[PDB]
Design a protein around this nucleic acid. Structure first.
Ligand SMILES: [Zn+2]
Ligand SMILES: [Zn+2]
Ligand SMILES: [Zn+2]
Ligand SMILES: [Zn+2]
Length: 118
RNA sequence: GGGCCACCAACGACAUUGAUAUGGUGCCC
């Protein structure tokens, strides 16, 4: 129906946001002011999302709440824990790039290693 | 200005398959 909540006013950008609080925070990127930044005593780095802000700030605390329940290995990111967990299930979501091949892999390292074998 | 997750794409640590890493898009005030 071509209906949207809120959009950016800058020409060429014109991204859409589902909250006015994020639309005003996005607008800071055009005026030239940081939206998010590390509040740590000896840090000045900046980010474009609250997710990145927390992700970065955990670098100072060393808090890693993502852990396996089969080998108990620990990771700083949930996306990486799942890439590890699939090694216990035997699943391999990747595939060889060559048309004359049909092998499958689970890590980018395995895929690239096989692409070098070709 | 802050919270919460998932999925997708990059990433290279190789004893080990990683007690290892970044981004994008989203949802709540
Ligand atoms: Zn914009
Ligand atoms: Zn910091
Ligand atoms: Zn495990
Ligand atoms: Zn192949």
């Amino acid at each position: 129906s071509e209906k949207r909540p809120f959009m950016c006013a800058y020409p060429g950008c014109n991204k859409r946001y589902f909250k006015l609080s994020h639309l005003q925070m996005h607008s800071r990127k055009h005026t030239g002011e940081k939206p998010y930044q590390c509040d740590f005593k000896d840090c000045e780095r900046r980010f474009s999302r609250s997710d990145q802000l927390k992700r970065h700030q955990r670098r100072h605390t060393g808090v890693k709440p993502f852990q396996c329940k089969t080998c108990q290995r620990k990771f700083s990111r949930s996306d990486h824990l799942k890439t590890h967990t699939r090694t216990h299930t035997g699943e391999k979501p990747f595939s060889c790039r060559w048309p004359s091949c049909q092998k499958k892999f689970a890590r980018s390292d395995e895929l690239v290693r096989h692409h070098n074998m070709h």
